[PDB]
Amino acid sequence: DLIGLHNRVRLRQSDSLKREIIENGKFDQWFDELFGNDTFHLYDSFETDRLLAKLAYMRSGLGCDVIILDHISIVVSASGESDERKMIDNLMTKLKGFAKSTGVVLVVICHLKNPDKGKAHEEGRPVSITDLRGSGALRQL
Amino acid sequence: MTYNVWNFGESNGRYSALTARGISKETCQKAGYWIAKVDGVMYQVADYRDQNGNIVSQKVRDKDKNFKTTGSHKSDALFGKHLWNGGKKIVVTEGEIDMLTVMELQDCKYPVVSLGHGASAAKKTCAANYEYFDQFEQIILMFDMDEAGRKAVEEAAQVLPAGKVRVAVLPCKDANECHLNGHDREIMEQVWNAGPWIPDGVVSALSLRERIREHLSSEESVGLLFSGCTGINDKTLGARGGEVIMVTSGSGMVMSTFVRQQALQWGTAMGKKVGLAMLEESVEETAEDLIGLHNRVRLRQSDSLKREIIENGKFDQWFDELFGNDTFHLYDSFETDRLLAKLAYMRSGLGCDVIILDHISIVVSASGESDERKMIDNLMTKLKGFAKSTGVVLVVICHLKNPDKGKAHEEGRPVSITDLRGSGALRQLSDTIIALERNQQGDMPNLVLVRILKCRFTGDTGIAGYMEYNKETGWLEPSSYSG
Amino acid sequence: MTYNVWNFGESNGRYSALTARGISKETCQKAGYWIAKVDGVMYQVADYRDQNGNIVSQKVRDKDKNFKTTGSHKSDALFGKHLWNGGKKIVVTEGEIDMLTVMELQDCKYPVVSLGHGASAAKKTCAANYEYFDQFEQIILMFDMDEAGRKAVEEAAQVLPAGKVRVAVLPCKDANECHLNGHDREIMEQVWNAGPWIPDGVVSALSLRERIREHLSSEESVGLLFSGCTGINDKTLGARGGEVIMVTSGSGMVMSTFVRQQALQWGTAMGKKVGLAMLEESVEETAEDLIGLHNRVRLRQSDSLKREIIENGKFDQWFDELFGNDTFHLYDSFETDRLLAKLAYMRSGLGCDVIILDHISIVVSASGESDERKMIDNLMTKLKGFAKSTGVVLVVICHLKNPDKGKAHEEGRPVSITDLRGSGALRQLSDTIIALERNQQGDMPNLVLVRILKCRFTGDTGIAGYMEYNKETGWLEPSSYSG
Amino acid sequence: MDEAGRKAVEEAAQVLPAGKVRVAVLPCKDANECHLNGHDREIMEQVWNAGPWIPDGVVSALSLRERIREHL
């Protein structure tokens, strides 16, 4: 998705182009082009504590200055515990800690609960901080 | 009250050399490893003090391998801790004796502390001490060289500060087993400049070239086209591997057909090996339903025809015809972990590229646990893992809770993701959600609608086409329909 | 320190042919099976080397059946391992001699190694070696042909890579027992291709041909047709043996009639022998209720008619008429286990093919135990077992918990599987769920609806038709009705 | 074919499998007392086609005629 985006082409979304650049050398070319400045690094998956630790070593070990964490909604692993309402907050803090404690820029993606009120999300309906998910931690931290 | 801290002298204390361990007398003396003897028997006492110098607790030993713990052994106990406040490097060993060891080999000039409850409480004891350990430039975990000892290292570093942790790697069980005639110099080569590792999941982009190339060829934009309603395809662009497609709907047997139908076409039209875990029905049953479906005849649902094809050879013929390309394989039943494992070997061993799991609603076996609400989620993730981790296409059928609101499911009532079962894991972890609605008491009681409820890869969602049940052949045929 | 590796020459070593085993001299020579003789007696020495070539350990034998193990025999030892690094297929045998054997036949063509501690340590030694073994396309396990030897295979494959393992099947205890005059060609036919396995529940379709055929003939589509509402039939295709039909509904005596009615027509129209456990009422009572129902007259419910037919001989006449075909049999009462047993002897002894169990809500006798919530389930299963285990059709009646939500049962209120009693067993274990609704204060107080709440065999569910109570004849008559 | 011997049958069939058990009924104490000059053919008529049961609560309908009449 990155490579494609960097090359203004919808790469995964196209059987033909994939084949094309694999063969015509452009892949290995584009790939070097974008990536060969040891500047992008990814956590690759399959806990909260466990994640936070990985993220930290990104910061501390490889020393990146932005960490993008796509999609907080996914807590994951330590199961015997109630409301994601509550837990979302607990993580939220460790994060803000991580952030301020180490000066890394932490972008955090987060998805919206769904109204119950008339017009949906694809109906444009604007969003407020009330409109907010969680139970206050993000709305704050 | 709690066990009194053992007074030196009160108990007949001597700072004697541990001849059994190659720890000098002068060494035991610095870390506070003294040898008492109370009421007759001679005990080995380890003096745990806080950073302030005061003895807060004792770990006492007798010959035969017993213990007795004095004072208040707080969750942050580190044996040796009081000796060092700062430094360029601090070794942290599993037990007291191993601390005494590194403290030798180095002529007690550098820092070593040992875990307070060592072994298992690696995580707690460590994070309890973040600040204390951050006082040093690098933290060298020299733990046991075994199963639980490598684990200890892992849980430890997780809670320990930043890019400071480095793992010790010795030739034997522990740093003392080495000293006890072997390789002192091996321990040394680690205290200085040893392994620094902890990224077991961080992965620099550069180092993915190959994995990426081979992906790009292997897995397909238009991965596997849904059959019986271009639309499903138009909107979702197919079932790409590593995805988790989730088919849901009302009473839908319509649903169990739709899935079956797909199984069919991927396992025959397309080359793909389908694996099926049809948890509801037998393995023979589902096999029949396939055969019948493939032959556009309602096979199990007909006494006469069954007899007919058994005798007229058509059975053995049809069977070969459909099956004899080792392309369908079924989990056959009578736990969660246990199922997941079987499904894995279908992926990994027989190497099918779709696994269809009919009907998540059935969790099953490990009974002492509350809400299916929660557990449905727990499974959900293992599955998504399985999926992404192995690139198998995992279709997962799932049945709908029932409204409480006016019009039922057979009354057609459309479905939303709110309308969703679980308590979020499917509503999340699933990549494409295909729902099928059917108002079985109406204008077209055989007409069935298809909503795409979600589709990460494209996010083009909504009504996506119609099909019609042929009561007669058994198929979900494609249908003309709109406004 | 550990037992020194035995030097060839130091011990008077020769590579000689094992004439006792039909292993050639040239053979022993490649795998490193040499014959020393130290301090007088002549020992057989197996030379275990790592992949790098160095001799890491020795397994030495003396004639009488002893051993002596030199060097460090690590948990991952494979005798012969150092010979092969890669290949299309590697035989793995239990012991050294059997390796030597495979190493002989064919004119010797494929890799063979033997288990390091073989026998019992099959699991450990193997998983120790995943990477080594994955170096080959298929791993042929040629272990002992006995109790613990098949087990070894099993524990082995479990830990061995993916879909590569195949099990060897020889005519004798081991591959050498074959060689030693018998069937070299038998060993051969296995090394090439010898079958695959050890998924204990994954089952490729191809491998079901036979099981399917025999199914198709054995089991039977339109099993026993519900009477009084084609619909019940249309949707469920009847009551197939070994199923568990579950009739439920509100206050329904309507329910207790419907079941009774079925009992009636199965045990008369159809040939089938019905067995009844009507736990609510007496055995005499239910019998009257049948008789009357069969003669379309409300027998018990009428002083006058009772007297009438006792005297005018019609009783003894009706009675014969209905009963005298030894087709109905009833459990007559005044535990769970205890009941189940009786029900079984109905099935097994008198061999009836339907057992109707009126009204599960009554558990009864073994009192010291909590929730009927839980226990309802326990019985549920024994039942479904009985059912499927013996192929008897088990109708089970069951009464409904009462809403708390607005409209009651006699206010018609429809029922869902959520609406269900129990705590999951029935909501599960039951194959078809027929529910009957009746709004006894309304437009048609005698009109009763039938939901198919579930039906494994077809999954076609929902509203399935209507009947009407004849307060007069006592029957649930079929009725005209829809939108 | 005695007090404790019929009892044995009872306790036996209770623990034995399903609808398989059938009781043997001989003219004398045991199957040998029969053989020892008597009725070999009596033992035979049992080995083939003996009497099948124990059911202490199962009750075929036919066998209720009387109880029913008197009920009515």
Side-chain angles (χ1 to χ4, degrees), chain C residues 205-364:
Chain C
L206 253 342
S207 56
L208 290 106
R209 142 140 38 213
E210 279 315 316
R211 187 159 18 139
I212 296 172
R213 154 120 39 51
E214 120 73 62
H215 178 105
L216 274 153
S217 324
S218 261
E219 239 28 69
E220 140 247 73
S221 28
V222 225
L224 239 78
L225 298 93
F226 285 114
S227 239
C229 185
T230 46
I232 335 292
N233 278 147
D234 282 353
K235 276 220 194 282
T236 82
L237 232 296
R240 285 155 294 283
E243 302 204 311
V244 146
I245 316 281
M246 157 142 321
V247 198
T248 196
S249 87
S251 203
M253 118 276 164
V254 245
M255 196 213 273
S256 220
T257 291
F258 178 77
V259 175
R260 219 131 291 194
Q261 220 144 139
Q262 248 71 32
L264 227 217
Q265 119 109 13
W266 291 344
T268 52
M270 332 298 251
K272 314 271 156 310
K273 241 175 225 115
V274 175
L276 304 170
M278 244 40 64
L279 307 204
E280 270 304 26
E281 71 209 22
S282 84
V283 63
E284 12 274 24
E285 275 182 13
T286 107
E288 315 185 9
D289 275 311
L290 274 188
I291 286 171
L293 192 35
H294 183 233
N295 286 76
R296 321 301 153 119
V297 308
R298 317 262 287 105
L299 186 41
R300 358 223 310 288
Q301 293 92 3
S302 158
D303 174 21
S304 64
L305 207 228
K306 265 123 117 247
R307 138 255 240 145
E308 239 251 302
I309 84 178
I310 295 281
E311 301 184 296
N312 69 1
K314 289 204 122 239
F315 166 82
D316 285 287
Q317 178 184 164
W318 278 1
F319 176 110
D320 290 343
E321 248 299 338
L322 158 71
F323 284 136
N325 245 223
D326 207 38
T327 163
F328 298 93
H329 313 254
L330 324 99
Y331 167 125
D332 133 38
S333 197
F334 192 166
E335 180 194 28
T336 171
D337 284 327
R338 162 203 276 79
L339 174 85
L340 236 324
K342 304 200 171 183
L343 269 123
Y345 162 92
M346 306 203 2
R347 172 37 133 152
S348 269
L350 348 110
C352 7
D353 13 45
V354 174
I355 291 289
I356 294 182
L357 179 54
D358 195 306
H359 193 33
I360 203 264
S361 321
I362 307 90
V363 282
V364 138

Side-chain angles (χ1 to χ4, degrees), chain B residues 309-368:
Chain B
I309 86 181
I310 299 281
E311 300 184 296
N312 72 359
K314 292 207 118 241
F315 164 85
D316 284 286
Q317 184 182 159
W318 279 0
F319 176 105
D320 284 343
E321 251 297 339
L322 156 69
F323 279 138
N325 244 225
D326 209 31
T327 162
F328 296 95
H329 310 259
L330 314 111
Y331 170 115
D332 127 42
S333 198
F334 192 162
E335 182 165 28
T336 171
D337 281 331
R338 161 208 276 81
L339 175 84
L340 235 327
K342 308 301 229 147
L343 265 123
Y345 165 94
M346 315 209 352
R347 180 30 138 156
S348 267
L350 347 112
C352 7
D353 12 43
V354 175
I355 292 282
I356 292 174
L357 179 55
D358 197 309
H359 184 26
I360 205 264
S361 320
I362 303 90
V363 282
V364 136
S365 245
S367 326

Side-chain angles (χ1 to χ4, degrees), chain A residues 65-83:
Chain A
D65 9 40
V66 173
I67 293 286
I68 293 185
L69 172 53
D70 194 315
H71 197 2
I72 204 266
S73 318
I74 304 95
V75 282
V76 137
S77 247
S79 326
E81 28 76 87
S82 308
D83 245 290

Side-chain angles (χ1 to χ4, degrees), chain C residues 284 288 310 315, chain D residues 64-72:
Chain C
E284 12 274 24
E288 315 185 9
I310 295 281
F315 166 82
Chain D
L64 292 106
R65 144 139 37 208
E66 282 315 317
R67 188 157 19 139
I68 296 173
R69 150 123 40 53
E70 120 72 61
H71 177 108
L72 275 151

